[PDB]
Design a protein around this nucleic acid. Sequence first.
DNA 1: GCGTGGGAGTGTT
DNA 2: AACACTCCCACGC
Length: 118
Amino acid sequence: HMRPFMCAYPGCNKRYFKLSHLQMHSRKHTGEKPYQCDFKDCERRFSRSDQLKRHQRRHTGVKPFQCKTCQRKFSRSDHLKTHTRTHTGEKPFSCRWPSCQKKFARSDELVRHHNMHQ
DNA sequence: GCGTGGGAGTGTT
DNA sequence: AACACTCCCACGC
Ligand SMILES: [Zn+2]
Ligand SMILES: [Zn+2]
Ligand SMILES: [Zn+2]
Ligand SMILES: [Zn+2]
């Protein structure tokens, strides 16, 4: 005998003989943070799937993004982008305090500068 | 200054 | 939905 009922979630193929058991299962997808890491002793939950798959690069230590200049590898592409700013010397973020023409290569660098102005 | 995590907005298929 | 880019914010050295 096979079960009549099923979860309509795209990926949950759990089937139940009883409707009561499917009802309890249906509330598992009503997800505070559905995506959870299943690496040993991490169990960290995330809101999106791509955020979890980015986090799991910590357990594997993979660095798929490499700098074309200094050959250094990085775990994420955005961190590679600002690393290239270290080589090219560009500083888009400029301080907007009077009589202070100071530029930085990262937004959080300018924020730290704006706070030290006070 | 700069590596390197999480959150979130957006785009392409 | 999967996948990716890209930004801010934050922690750390
Ligand atoms: Zn389900
Ligand atoms: Zn994990
Ligand atoms: Zn480099
Ligand atoms: Zn300034």
